[PDB]
Amino acid sequence: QDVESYDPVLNPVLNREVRRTGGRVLITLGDQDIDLSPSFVIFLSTRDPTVEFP
Amino acid sequence: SLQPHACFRLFLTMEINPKVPVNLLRAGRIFVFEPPPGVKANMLRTFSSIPVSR
Amino acid sequence: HTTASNWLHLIPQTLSHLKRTENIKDPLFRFFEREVKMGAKLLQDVRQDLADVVQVCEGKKKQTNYLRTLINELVKGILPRSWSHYTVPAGMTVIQWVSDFSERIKQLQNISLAAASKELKNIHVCLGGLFVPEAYITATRQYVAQANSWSLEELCLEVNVSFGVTGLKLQGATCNNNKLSLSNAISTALPLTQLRWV
Amino acid sequence: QGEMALEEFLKQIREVWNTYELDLVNYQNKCRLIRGWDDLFNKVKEHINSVSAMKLSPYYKVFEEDALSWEDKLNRIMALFDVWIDVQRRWVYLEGIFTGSADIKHLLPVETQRFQSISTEFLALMKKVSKSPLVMDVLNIQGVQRSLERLADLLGKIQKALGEYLERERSSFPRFYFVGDEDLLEIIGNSKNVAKLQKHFKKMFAGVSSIILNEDNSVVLGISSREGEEVMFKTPVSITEHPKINEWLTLVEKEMRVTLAKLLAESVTEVEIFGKATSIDPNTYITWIDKYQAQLVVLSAQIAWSENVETALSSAAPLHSVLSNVEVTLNVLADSVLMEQPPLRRRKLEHLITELVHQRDVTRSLIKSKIDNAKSFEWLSQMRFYFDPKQTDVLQQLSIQMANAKFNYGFEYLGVQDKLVQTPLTDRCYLTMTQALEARLGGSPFGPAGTGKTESVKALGHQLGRFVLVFNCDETFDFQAMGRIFVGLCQVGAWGCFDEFNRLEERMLSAVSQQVQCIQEALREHSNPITCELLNKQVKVSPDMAIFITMNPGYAGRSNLPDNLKKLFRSLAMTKPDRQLIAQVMLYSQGFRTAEVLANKIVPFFKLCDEQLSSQSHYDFGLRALKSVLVSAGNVKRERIQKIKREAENLPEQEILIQSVCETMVPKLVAEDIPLLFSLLSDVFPGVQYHRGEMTALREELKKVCQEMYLTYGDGEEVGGMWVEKVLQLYQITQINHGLMMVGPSGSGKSMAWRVLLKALERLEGVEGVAHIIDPKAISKDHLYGTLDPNTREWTDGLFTHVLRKIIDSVRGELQKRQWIVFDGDVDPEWVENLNSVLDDNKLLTLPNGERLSLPPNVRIMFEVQDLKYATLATVSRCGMVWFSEDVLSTDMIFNNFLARLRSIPLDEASPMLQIQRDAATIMQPYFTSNGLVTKALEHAFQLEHIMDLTRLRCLGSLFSMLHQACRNVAQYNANHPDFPMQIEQLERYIQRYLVYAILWSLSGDSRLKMRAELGEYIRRITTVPLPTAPNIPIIDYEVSISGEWSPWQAKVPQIEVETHKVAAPDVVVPTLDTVRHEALLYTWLAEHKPLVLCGPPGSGKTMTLFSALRALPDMEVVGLNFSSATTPELLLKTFDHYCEYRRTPNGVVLAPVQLGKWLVLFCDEINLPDMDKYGTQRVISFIRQMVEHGGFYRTSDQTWVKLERIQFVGACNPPTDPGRKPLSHRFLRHVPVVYVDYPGPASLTQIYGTFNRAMLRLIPSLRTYAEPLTAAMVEFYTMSQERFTQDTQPHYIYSPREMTRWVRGIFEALRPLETLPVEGLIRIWAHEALRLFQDRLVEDEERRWTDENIDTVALKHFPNIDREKAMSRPILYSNWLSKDYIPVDQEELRDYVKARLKVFYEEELDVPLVLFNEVLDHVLRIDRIFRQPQGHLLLIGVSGAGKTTLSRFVAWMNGLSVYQIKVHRKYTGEDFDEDLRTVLRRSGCKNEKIAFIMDESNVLDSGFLERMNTLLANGEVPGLFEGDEYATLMTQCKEGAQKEGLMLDSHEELYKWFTSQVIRNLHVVFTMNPSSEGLKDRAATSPALFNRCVLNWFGDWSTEALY
Ligand SMILES: Nc1ncnc2c1ncn2[C@@H]1O[C@H](COP(=O)(O)OP(=O)(O)OP(=O)(O)O)[C@@H](O)[C@H]1O
Ligand SMILES: Nc1ncnc2c1ncn2[C@@H]1O[C@H](COP(=O)(O)OP(=O)(O)O)[C@@H](O)[C@H]1O
Ligand SMILES: Nc1ncnc2c1ncn2[C@@H]1O[C@H](COP(=O)(O)OP(=O)(O)O)[C@@H](O)[C@H]1O
Ligand SMILES: Nc1ncnc2c1ncn2[C@@H]1O[C@H](COP(=O)(O)OP(=O)(O)O)[C@@H](O)[C@H]1O
Ligand SMILES: [Mg+2]
Ligand SMILES: [Mg+2]
């Protein structure tokens, strides 16, 4: 919730900038390498219709 | 993000300023205090404000 | 920019010039001299700004930052801060301010013509068109005081409808035989107000 | 014999130093400290002066060694004793507090142990120094410097750490809240000395300035005011009982009140037995006045009058009797004041006359109407006084009353103060504020400045006997600070009179409204041991609280009061004071027979002056000016009466008032208003007349000083008459005024005026005159005034505050000298409003601590400003103006000063240089007299127009520097010809032409070619000087040879052919006429280490010309400084930190470069860019002007004058008409000459790049015949592209020869390894480079197609009989991936190769699929082309999600670069950005690896990001990024990297140079941002490197072709 204060840590996740280490799936997040399961989804909520996004 | 006590009222007093967030304007109930229309209404509020025992 | 150039071409058709016209001990002469000098300075800066805008809007000349500020102010319709040197009533519009300033320049031209021919005492001035009407009142009081060799602090004002002023307008009253009657008219123009010092 | 006399003087010095020992006195049977430092310091300083005088002349060369030994030993002992006085002064009160104060070891055990160790060390040193009192023996102890430094440092540390006990001590004695930390430490430490407390009672009490003590200092006999009035206690308080300091201070403050009550009772008894008679005896009346103090006398008179009026109204005859008695008394007062009295008694007389005339007016108004009963409101409205002797409580015997508001007199000793003329407006204010006080509401008068608001509140407080405080609050007054001052006022029972309350940071105003409400509730509870909650603490509230507010509505757009705080104050509007009544009462009180006539002629005079005079920003004719005129009139009347008595009679009161008016108001007038004001004076006062002059002694001393320091002095009608009269007026205003300004245009001579006046006053009165020159805008307001730490309640002193505190303390005898604090800047209400209480009659500076620093009478705060168009009336009114007009200083006296400075003071500092200088001066004497030639040429230069506003003094100083260069050139020629010296006629005929050349390049150095030719034509027409006979060639195209004739620079420029190795190298300059003229003129500037400014359009060649000029000077090191919109002097301070060191010398600290023998030159590349404040000032420009004019700046660490040793400036700027430029101040442009370097133009550009193309087309000999058509096509295409792609369309549409240089370099780099090329291939590579340089920055398809049409038609026109199909095509792609060389490739093979590389790239780094098309192919080729070149940065403009950073990552991976992104998160601040930059810089320079620093616009959070990115992009290094530990780590890593590479380097400068080279070769920054209408303009303004050193590529949205 509260995507008004959007944190840019989610940019590689949303862009799906993902590595390929053989059969394993590797992504970067901050300063650590993260393996993500394929069954991962994320939703961002907002209670403010009159919000401006960059 | 809270469920408060039954007899709890938060009072926010402010001047009419565009800087007030639209989120807070939508969340709260807005009361506008203005100079009265008419001598009759002015004297009515004056007499209601001054206590009878005085 | 075509519409702006047309408007700035038609603006200085009501503005031509002002005579510069200064060694006299009377307050009236020096007050009129300094008023005409201030009007000439304001007119020459406004004329230079208008010429600059016209040349850079229809012709070959680059754009500076002050010029950009002036052009933006002119398009937005707000008076530039540099032009507003006298008192402007409650933030007027340039459309009527140019007419008011042209009227003031024409008045100062009339003062200059009268001074080219004491001679300036018999003229009639509208106090709205003067930059400093309070200074005009002080100057005429000082003139009558020095001429009659009276006191400078025990002089009262007698008003009839030796100094005539124009442009004064009443508010919710009527003048008849120097007597005031209440009226529902919002403003009745005084034809000519006579200021005699006793 | 002279040498023997000097040796005898040295022997006398040795004897008086071997016979001088430190004087020691026992301190409470503990130690023998040293006192009497003034004589020691005076002896040291006169010995230094004698040694310096002997060193200059005449036989210093024989006693050099022992003279230098004596000099440096004297400096050493001076430094040791300067530290010794400070450490002993701190130690005395530290020992006092740590011994007398109890529960200190129980509360600060580590501090007590530390001070025990320090005390043992200091007593050991005291025993050592008491063993041998001889000063040389004292110097003989080793390690005294380090021992004293450690002692001072640890004493300061424990002094700072002791601050927690100060609040606990303040809770005991309430009055300590207004005393600062170190001052309170002195109070507690010197409690057992008492005599050292006498300089803080002024801050502690109202009028009590000292305490009268006995011989044993055991009993306090009495208290004394500042003016010598003393009050003796009825029952003395004894310290010999051993009470604590707070205990006996409380006893003193109670005894003062009871003593004043007893004396009030006795005095009112005396007045009661006086006033019962219809006639009074002046003898007994004067004895009574001498018997009782001023406030007691006035109070007794008021009590007697009120009682008489009440008894009369109790019952019309008694009211007439009371009025008659009042008139008889007032006549007695007037007759007594008409003669001569002692000053204190005379001021008592004046207060009595004011009060009695108010009483007479009140009785007249009461008897004019029919009043019968005492309960009528016509009498109940006026303030009345009641005395009840039957009240057994002596404090509550007097009851001040008004309309239903009973009051009790506070009985605080006010001393004397200054009474106020009780106008009807003042009575209305009294009634309203006393109604507010009865209602327990604080008062709040408001109105324009000068109506008498704070003085009315202070007068009301003095009438009530309340201790009043005036605070000049500002935006730095925090909620905690207001809580502290409120709790102090609550403890003491005082009044608050916060002045200018509206400028208090609205949030803080709302916050302090709660504290005000709590105080109001506490007072209401008292009205019915009360407490109120302030700062979450309960404090007792005395019932004498009053919070008064003084404010001007909309004075400078200040903050507005919220309604919550407005409801807690009773407002009052007051705009028109009774100036007539004030003037009449003041003149009648001072003693004037025609008092009413003088008032009725002076108040309408001021009314006429406010209208008939011209409107100027520095005119004030208000009530403050009127009161200053009245006070000066009284003083000059006293002086004239004393002068007559030196020989009652009659005096010319009209003439006295005229003289006062003239002396106060004449200097502020403009040159056209003197006859107008004289006409006003003659009109109002017919037989007025005036007298001036009679200042022979000061005038002749001023003439002597002017002759000594090479100034021009006039006799009043001579050449310097206006300037000397202005100096005399400045002297008069300093004498009769408090704070001054010198308002006038730049170059009016105000600095020399006040300097010469100060030196003349020095040599006349014999008192030392020291001047402190402060620039208030070169530093922050916090550094100027102070800063309160938000965490701990500690105060860091500002510059002005530190200077004033040092003068107040006067440990070096600063009070006996003459101090002139000079603010050499410009005035705006951000910081000058803090001095409102300073420049007022309060004479005290207010701080947020509650510490109020008084202003000593020897200090005159002076202003040296250019204009007051941003200053407010509240600060214009308080000062005394001196108007320095531009025509006050005429150019002939500048010429005379220059000629004198040339005749004397030789440049290489009798002498051959001095002889050559004198010869040149007598050659150029005829050209400087009156009009001559130089003045006419300067007037014509004024009539011309320039790229900057031409002041006379800028070009005039530039001409003077050029003439000094001519003299140096003559000296160098004589040195190079030792056999044959310079012939006098050759020198004459050489200087006679160098003068014309210098005035040409000085007056027309900043103008266009046609106008410098026009000035040359005017000079040729106007001068009789031999000139070249070339009708077409201008004079500006000629040089003067040392033989004395004219030669062109066309002979100087050769037709050099550069080598193929360096075709477009950065250091390669092909010479042209403009180039050689500009570097010759630059060398002429730089030879005297003078600042300069290189103005011109971007890419014109300004830094190339500057570096070509500096390459001829081997002893100069150039450092690059880049300025942006958000530039601060912190950048220059960081550069000084990195490349220079701070040394210590006995005559102050100096700042010199680390590499000795070299003159560091600072190159500010965008000096024009720093943002202009809303009051029209620039901090960086003010800083540079301060350190160019005054020769140094101020270090904000410890407030010390740091003097630049070898530092000079060069500046570069675009013209001020460019979109982001704001014009420089005239006060900064006064010093810097400016030269306008323009674009080379077609004629110069053709040969400039013909040389480069001819050199480049040598690898292939079959292509060398096409260099001229290639250059013609190149120049024509660049010119025709420059015409319409101007900055008005897009902010980045700038074109310059930098693009032509990049074009030539690109063609050469494509032509190097290829070794065989047809003409078709040459046209193809030329077209490809043209497209890459002229189409990529464009925005629209129409202009892209326009440039394609341009390139096609230019190739067709300049390249006939060519294969158009083979040369021109659609893809025109060039690549070096398929082969080893830069061979053109087709689209399909490139697409297949990119597809295969992306197939490899998917599993390697990023597994995100991409779709290939022509725009992506073009983008990746452009990005690879930029990445290939060194220092290759990118600026990609396009919509989000267009794949810019993905393509950048792919190209960086394929080219071997490493991709870095900063990985921004929440709370990613500047320190985190600095850590990321440090890691990137280390990896790029120390580790020698490629880095593709990808950065997005979303990564920007502050302007510090852009500032560091600007510095990194433009220079390759960020000064101030590495300092200390990380700097040493970088140096070790750089040394290891150099060892790994194979280069053995040492020291630090060359290692940092190699690190910068590694960064500039191995670091690439890619900046991606979204397009915007104003965002691009703002980014260009805030970072010019992103638009200069970054290659721009407008990717934009996907086109329709791309989408399909
Ligand atoms: N009376 C004088 N006779 C001859 N030369 C003078 C005289 N007064 C000033 N000058 C010359 O004028 C120069 C500039 O004057 P000054 O240094 O007083 O600057 P200023 O008017 O205070 O300037 P700013 O307003 O920029 O601070 C001085 O360096 C000095 O050489
Ligand atoms: N009624 C008065 N009688 C005598 N002097 C007055 C009177 N009112 C004002 N003044 C003088 O005029 C000056 C006005 O200062 P003031 O207006 O009180 O400062 P501020 O603008 O901060 O309120 C003061 O120096 C005061 O001495
Ligand atoms: N006479 C010349 N000879 C050789 N190159 C020149 C000449 N004049 C200008 N240039 C080119 O112009 C560029 C200089 O621009 P520069 O001095 O950096 O402008 P700015 O300092 O305003 O950015 C250099 O790249 C240089 O190649
Ligand atoms: N040519 C292309 N073909 C397919 N997808 C693309 C292409 N260009 C960009 N993308 C998409 O855009 C995303 C990359 O976003 P990014 O590179 O941050 O855009 P920008 O650089 O414009 O901010 C990737 O997830 C990718 O799916
Ligand atoms: Mg005030
Ligand atoms: Mg100066």
Numbering used by the authors:
A (entry chain A): 3636 to 3689
B (entry chain A): 4115 to 4168
C (entry chain A): 4381 to 4401, 4403 to 4498, 4502 to 4545, 4557 to 4593
D (entry chain A): 1454 to 1768, 1775 to 1987, 1996 to 2114, 2128 to 2389, 2409 to 3103
Manuscript excerpt for this entry:
Cytoplasmic dynein-1 is a conserved, minus-end-directed microtubule motor critical for cell division and long-range intracellular transport in eukaryotic cells. Dynein, a member of the AAA + (ATPase associated with various cellular activities) family, forms a 1.4 MDa dimer composed of two copies each of heavy (HC), intermediate (IC), light intermediate (LIC), and three (TCTEX, LC8, and ROBL) light chains (LC), with the IC, LIC, and LC known as accessory chains. Cellular and structural studies have shown that dynein primarily exists in a pseudo-twofold symmetric, autoinhibited Phi state incompatible with movement along microtubules. LIS1 plays essential roles in the activation of dynein, including relieving autoinhibition and helping assemble the fully active DDA transport complexes.
